[PDB]
RNA sequence: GACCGAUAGUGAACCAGUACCGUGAGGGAAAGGUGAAAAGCACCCCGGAAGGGGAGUGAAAGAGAUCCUGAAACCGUGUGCCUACAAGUAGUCAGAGCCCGUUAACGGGUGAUGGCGUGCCUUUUGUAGAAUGAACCGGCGAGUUACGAUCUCGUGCAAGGUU
RNA sequence: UAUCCUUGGGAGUCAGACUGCGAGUGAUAAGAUCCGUAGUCGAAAGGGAAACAGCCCAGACCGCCAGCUAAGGUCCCAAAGU
RNA sequence: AACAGUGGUAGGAGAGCGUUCUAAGGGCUGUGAAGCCAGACCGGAAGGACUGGUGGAGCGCUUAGAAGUGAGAAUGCCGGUA
């Protein structure tokens, strides 16, 4: 088997995991094409990080791209950065710029 | 102690009880910048014991060792040249393999200058013994002009 | 150690005619039957009952003035009303309910007393549609 | 079968059982005699009313022992008493042989 | 309106039950032989309907 | 000289937190909330260790009233008679294996019989 | 030094009376650790890059730059048992079925169903209370010390005992 | 039957509550108020009175899948007499 | 060996477990120390071992002595996270 990971991209992890729900467990034919035609902010980036692995798999273990399937697929969360917006009366409020980590690993069928 | 930190001479935050608990300052002993109780204060530990008291754990202890035969009782223990290889051959001829203190009448250079790298070893002058010293070292070896010296004052 | 018993329990049939009867009187032994109290192996969490049918459920009878002023309500959650029926009116025209009810207050209340209630059937009339599964005759009091 | 009557309590036993009672004064290896074998049962049912006469249970020691430990935790709610103890309660495994009405 | 306490685990993993996203309904293009939507022109040749858009 | 507190209060909680597996949601996790269950457990097994002697009589008690029953009388009128005036020994938790050796039992309850007359 | 060891010891182990706050007098922080040695990743592959997968160095790369060890709250991914007719301070005692094999022991994990059961602390004559406290986890956080008085126990000597 | 008194060290306590029996106070009215006398809570769990500080029975060192009883009970819920 | 006893708040008396440092002798570790993570072991309690994984250099036992000696609560302080 092969694997990737991401390791701080700049996305929060409750919205990326929306889009890792529909590609596991399928083959990496049609989650290229699923991960193509879905409008959410997160499916560029999860994209490249299933294509890097397939790469990692016929280059480095020679195996084929034809007979590989999505394993595993999970996403974890990384450091946060914590930022102040202006409120009412001085409030000052705190923003969290969340961040994640995305792991993708492909194996043979 | 709580006058001794650095700063906190006002109310913290504008004394406001209004969510939080009440604070007077922020050197306080549960605050996070310091204040400590009760601590440690400098001072001594010394005290006394009876002047009879003194002379009985003195006599007690010298007793105890012609008991358990660990006293040895030389007659002149001189020495010319100040070598610590010969004074390390005295000690294997009268069998001592372990801790030792030797008592010497008053003040002897030579052996006292020699046996002061060898690690068991302990020389002192006749009115220099005492109860933490002789009972630490598991075998005394005195002259024959210190017991003179010892009895006269006990 | 006792014995429980656990899907090795073998029910039966049994028909018991209501035919010169108090309500009452029939419903006790009725509710200690579904129970299973009558049997050397009971266990008090397994349902070891046995199944009665009961013909003739429109010739009860009550003792004394309880044809007319036992009352039967009924109410809703939160409507803002109650509804009544005379118990001479429930026998006539609901027999097989005035049984019901009288029988599912004598048995406990939870998972196995809503369990163990699925094995009464109260008919009017004399004839019962379970021939196959072969019932006995029951006679009350022991 | 017969019925024995040995720790305080009765126990229904038969010939080539293990069971656990309460501590005997023997040791292992020993032979025990029950004495009191109320209703030696059956073929040849006997119905004793203390005691049918004449018989006796023999059995062997196979253990002494503790059983597992349990914890007596004890609390009373807003008035600071609490007291915690250990207990581990010893017994004797015997098996049995020839039960001789 | 203020939350009388705190909301439990599983009181919001159920919560989360209808909050999924459903997969495109996508088919295969008759002339390069990627997937495109129904009803949509193709975004890597260009064609639909048999014919070129471009 | 100082004495900070490093490693004693970690097993000391650690302790409390084995106790509690098995527990519903934060009564697993937390220390403060699983300590309270624990002290819990402890007054209710030792309640439940003596009404678990009560339990088992009043089971014992209903099947040897419908063995009875099965012949031609009451609990109460086969105790009085087997224990009283026929004066066998048995008690309820042995006298209840009417369960496997029914044809046993009907020799004890036809032997309280001819006390009552 | 029977002193501290990074929430401790100076406010300050580190470009600290600094950054910030105030018109001003003035108040005043947070922040230690690659490796024995940079030998601190040539070259190849995916990517715009960040970041990865190999190959190398090394005793260790799960020591790769906030780089010794790395707990708990919190967030996830797989799976063994249970769960869509049920009224529960969530446990405890009784108990089938299914799944495993231990510091070998009258073993371990889940539990359909039955009985019992009004949190913890404080304060009050008295609490389950529309009495008070706590969002959760981790660290820190409260009868000492000096000088007098008095009583018991221990030791030495005793009508003398101690400087 | 096994308590009692003296001397010395150390304390806590000082708005008690309700029930039964004797009196004031109020309207011989409150779960009101204040005295004498006994009990129980306070500082006491367990069984009964449906639930129940103070009423009836009774005082938990721990373990048992043993037995006899108290107050109260024996048609079913719910152990024991249709 | 007989007997007798063992509910408990304020409070009095007794016996103990652990933590850091110091002194004596005696001794464990690169063939893997402290710490951390699991487990179905042992003791009347506080508590203590033994196997396995991580970690990569220090630690414990016996008898005495000193104390910044034990945390669930203070609308406690600091950090992290819901």
């Not at chain 3, 049939?13 to 035919?19: M, S």
């Not at chain 6, 009128?77 to 026929?86: D, E, N, P, V």
Request: one cysteine or more.
């Amino acid at each position: 088997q092969a694997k990737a990971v991401a390791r701080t991209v700049r996305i929060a992890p409750r919205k990326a995991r929306l889009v890792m729900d529909l590609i596991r467990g399928k083959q990496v034919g049609e989650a290229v094409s699923i991960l193509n035609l879905t409008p959410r902010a997160a499916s560029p980036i999860i994209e490249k990080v299933l294509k890097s692995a397939i790469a990692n798999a016929e280059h480095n273990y020679e195996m084929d791209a034809n007979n590989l399937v999505i394993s595993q697929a999970f996403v974890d969360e990384g450091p946060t950065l914590k930022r102040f917006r202006p409120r009412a009366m001085g409030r000052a409020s705190q923003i969290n710029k969340r961040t994640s980590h995305i792991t993708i690993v492909v194996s043979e069928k | 102690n709580r006058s001794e930190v650095r700063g906190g001479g006002r109310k913290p935050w504008r004394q406001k009880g209004t969510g939080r608990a009440r604070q007077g300052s922020i050197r306080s002993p549960q605050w996070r910048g310091g204040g400590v109780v009760f601590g440690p204060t400098p001072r001594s530990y010394s005290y006394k014991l009876p002047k009879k008291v003194r002379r009985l754990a003195i006599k007690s202890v010298l007793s105890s060792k012609v008991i358990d035969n660990n006293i040895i009782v030389l007659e002149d223990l001189t020495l010319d040249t100040a070598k610590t290889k010969e004074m390390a051959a005295i000690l294997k001829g009268l069998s001592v393999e372990k801790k030792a203190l030797i008592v010497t009448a008053d003040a002897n250079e030579a052996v006292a200058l020699s046996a002061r790298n060898i690690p068991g070893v302990t020389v002192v002058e006749a009115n220099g013994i005492n109860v933490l010293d002789v009972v630490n070292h598991e075998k005394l070896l005195i002259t024959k002009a210190a017991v003179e010296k010892v009895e006269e004052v006990l | 150690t006792p014995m429980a018993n656990a899907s090795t329990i073998e029910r039966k049939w049994l028909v018991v005619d209501a035919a010169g009867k108090t309500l009452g009187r029939l419903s006790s032994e009725v509710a200690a039957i579904l129970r299973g109290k009558h049997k050397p192996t009971y266990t008090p969490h397994v349902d070891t009952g046995d199944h009665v049918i009961i013909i003739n459920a429109e010739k009860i009878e009550l003792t004394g003035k309880k044809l007319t002023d036992k009352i039967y309500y009924r109410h809703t959650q939160h409507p803002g009303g109650l509804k009544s029926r005379t118990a001479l009116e429930m026998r006539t025209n609901y027999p097989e309910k005035m049984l019901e009810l009288a029988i599912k207050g004598m048995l406990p209340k939870g998972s196995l007393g809503r369990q163990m209630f699925k094995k009464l059937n109260v008919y009017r009339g004399s004839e019962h549609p379970h021939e196959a599964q072969k019932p006995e005759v029951y006679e009350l009091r022991g | 079968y017969a019925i024995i009557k040995t720790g305080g309590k009765q126990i229904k036993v038969e010939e080539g059982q293990t069971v656990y009672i309460e501590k005997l004064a023997a040791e292992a290896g020993e032979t025990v005699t029950f004495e009191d074998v109320l209703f030696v049962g059956g073929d040849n049912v006997k119905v004793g009313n203390p005691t049918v006469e004449g018989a006796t249970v023999t059995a062997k020691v196979e253990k002494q022992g503790r059983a597992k430990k349990i914890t007596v935790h004890r609390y009373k709610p807003k008035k600071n008493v609490a007291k915690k103890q250990g207990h581990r309660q010893p017994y004797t495994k015997v098996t049995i042989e020839k039960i001789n009405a | 309106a203020v939350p009388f306490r705190r909301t439990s685990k599983m009181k919001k993993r159920l919560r989360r039950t209808h909050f999924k996203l459903n997969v495109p309904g996508m088919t295969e293009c008759p002339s390069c032989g990627e997937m495109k939507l129904s009803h949509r022109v193709c975004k890597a040749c260009g064609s639909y309907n048999g014919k070129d858009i471009n | 000289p100082r004495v900070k507190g490093g490693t004693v209060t970690r097993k000391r909680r650690k302790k409390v937190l084995k106790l509690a597996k098995g527990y519903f949601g934060s009564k697993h996790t937390l220390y403060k909330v699983a300590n309270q269950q624990v002290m819990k457990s402890g007054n209710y097994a030792f309640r439940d260790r003596r009404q678990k002697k009560r339990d088992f009589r009043k089971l014992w008690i209903t099947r040897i009233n419908a063995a009875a029953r099965m012949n031609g009388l009451s609990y109460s009128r086969l105790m009085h008679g087997l224990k009283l005036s026929g004066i066998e020994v048995n008690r309820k938790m042995l006298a209840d294996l009417a369960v496997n050796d029914l044809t046993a039992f009907n020799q004890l309850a036809d032997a309280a019989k001819a006390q009552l007359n």
